Amino acid sequence: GSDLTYAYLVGLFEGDGYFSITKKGKYLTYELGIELSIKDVQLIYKIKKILGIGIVSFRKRNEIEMVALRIRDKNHLKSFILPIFEKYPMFSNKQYDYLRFRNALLSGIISLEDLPDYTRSDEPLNSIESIINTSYFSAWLVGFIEAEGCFSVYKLNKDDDYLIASFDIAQRDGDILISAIRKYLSFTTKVYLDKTNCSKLKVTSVRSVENIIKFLQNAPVKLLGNKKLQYLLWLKQLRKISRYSEKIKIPSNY
DNA sequence: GCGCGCTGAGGAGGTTTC
DNA sequence: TCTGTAAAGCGCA
DNA sequence: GCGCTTTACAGAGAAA
DNA sequence: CCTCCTCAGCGCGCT
Ligand SMILES: [Mg+2]
Ligand SMILES: [Mg+2]
Numbered sequence: 498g499s500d501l502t503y504a505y506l507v508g509l510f511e512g513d514g515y516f517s518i519t520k521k522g523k524y525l526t527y528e529l530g531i532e533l534s535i536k537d538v539q540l541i542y543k544i545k546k547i548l549g550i551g552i553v554s555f556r557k558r559n560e561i562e563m564v565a566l567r568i569r570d571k572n573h574l575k576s577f578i579l580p581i582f583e584k585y586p587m588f589s590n591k592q593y594d595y596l597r598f599r600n601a602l603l604s605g606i607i608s609l610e611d612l613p614d615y616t617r618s619d620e621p622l623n624s625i626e627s628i629i630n631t632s633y634f635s636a637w638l639v640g641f642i643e644a645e646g647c648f649s650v651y652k653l654n655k656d657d658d659y660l661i662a663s664f665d666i667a668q669r670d671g672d673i674l675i676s677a678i679r680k681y682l683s684f685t686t687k688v689y690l691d692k693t694n695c696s697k698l699k700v701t702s703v704r705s706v707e708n709i710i711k712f713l714q715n716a717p718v719k720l721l722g723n724k725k726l727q728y729l730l731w732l733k734q735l736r737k738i739s740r741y742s743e744k745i746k747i748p749s750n751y
Numbered sequence: 752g753c754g755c756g757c758t759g760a761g762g763a764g765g766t767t768t769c
Numbered sequence: 770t771c772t773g774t775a776a777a778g779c780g781c782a
Numbered sequence: 783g784c785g786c787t788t789t790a791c792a793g794a795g796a797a798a
Numbered sequence: 799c800c801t802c803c804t805c806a807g808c809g810c811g812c813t
Contacts (some may be wrong), residue, residue, distance in 0.1 A: 512769090513798065515799050522803065524757065532799070534797055552760060561796065569759055607757075644798095645769065647770045654774085659786080665770075667769060689791060695768070701788055740787075 498547045504585040504633035505718045506547065508640025511587040512668075516598040520609055527602055528569040529578055533723075535562035540643075540722030550577055574602065585637065588628045589674045593617045619670040619694060628677040636717045638678060642666065643724045648731035650738075660738045662731070664709045665699035672696045682708050706735070707745045719751050 498506070514531040533541060535555070541564045545551045550573045551566040568574060579602070582595050597615045606612050628634060646666045653659045668675050675688050675696035684705050689697045700706065713720070713728070720728065732748050735741045 513799080515798090517800060519801050520803085521758085526759075526802085528759095530799085532798065536797095554761075556763075558763090558797095563797075567760090571758085645770075647769085647772095649771055651772050653787090661773090661788090663772085665769095667770080669768060686788090687790065691792065693768075697769090697792085699789090703787085705788095 499718065501633060501636045501717045502547065503581050504636040505640040505643075506544065507582055507585050507587055508637040508642075509544075509644045510640075511589060511591055511637075512641045512644025516594040518598060518601055518606075518612060524607055525609060525612065526569055527571055527574060527598070528567055529574065529598075530565055530567040532563050532565040535564055537723045538564045541566050543721055548577065548581075571602065579603075585633050588623055588631075588634075588637070588677075589668065590617060590619055590621055590670050592622055621671075621673045624673050625677040625680055628674065629681055634681070635712075638681070639713070639716045639718050639720060641678075642713075643720050643722055646724065648724075648728050650731065650734045660734070661701055662706060662735060662738055662741060663699055663701045664706065664731075665697065667691075667695050667697035669693055669695045682712055684708070703740055703744050706741060710745060710747060713751050716751075725751060 510529070510531060513533060514529060517526075517528055517530070519526045519528070531541070531544070538555075541553060544566050545553060548566075548568070550570070551568045554565045554567065556563050556565075568578060579599055582599075586592055587595060594617060597613070601612055645668065646664065648664055650660050650662045653661055666675070666678065672688065672690065675698050679686075679688055679698050682705075684698065684700050686698065686700050686702075686705070689699075691697060700709075710732075719725070728751065729748075735745075735747065
């Protein structure tokens with residue numbers, strides 16, 4: 498990878514991965530994993546390549562196929578993973594998972610009984626300005642998008658053929674995170690908090706759309722998975738929708 | 752040559768955030 | 770994540 | 783006062 | 799995203 502394609506990785510992991518210290522009979526299993534739709538087998542192997550470690554597995558949970566990259570080897574974790582996340586730390590209230598994980602690990606905790614009682618605080622760690630001002634952000638956001646962003650098109654009413662074309666992204670307990678992104682890309686839609694503590698950001702404007710495209714075209718790194726394809730197909734329909742077409746530039750990649 | 756302490760690949764059950 | 774629905778804003782004819 | 787455009791709000795599940 | 803369990807199996811210190 499690049500100095501920065503790793504920042505891309507914590508991005509992806511923050512949004513779709515997970516740190517976990519689980520019960521393994523008498524002992525513990527330390528791991529980092531991402532489980533994605535089989536639609537990203539190809540991406541899973543690009544991650545293994547970048548990181549250089551990790552076990553890949555497949556399963557059906559019967560009609561949905563899925564791929565997973567899983568790193569449980571503690572030496573490899575200490576030797577390759579911590580370092581990444583130390584250098585390019587996550588931003589959301591998730592770092593609590595990594596800090597907790599890290600500590601238990603470095604402490605040499607190997608039994609369930611000496612493993613601290615842990616529960617993620619919903620309490621944020623940063624606030625807009627700090628996220629937005631960290632160097633690697635631009636890259637991180639690319640992966641975070643790879644992971645949780647959504648490109649889509651839908652008619653506004655059943656009957657008539659008036660398309661909308663939106664880009665959205667949400668996160669539980671992440672008002673500060675979601676808002677910060679919102680600021681960064683200059684959206685002005687109102688971030689919506691749902692039934693859960695899930696902050697949803699969504700845009701439809703000709704100017705908003707114009708903006709992700711530009712952020713992406715000028716982001717340090719690149720989307721390389723299914724989301725990349727989702728975006729390219731989006732791009733495409735964006736040409737058959739006039740209001741957008743006579744209003745922005747677009748396709749070669751990302 | 753074996754029993755012990757501990758480990759991770761392999762395999763899979765159970766919730767819920769996107 | 771992905772796709773809406775019901776309901777506005779904004780000219781302008 | 784009607785065409786075109788954005789927006790607040792939010793419900794299923796597949797993909798986490 | 800999150801969690802648990804089985805089982806070769808590896809290095810040790812003994813019988
Ligand atoms: Mg996530
Ligand atoms: Mg994803």
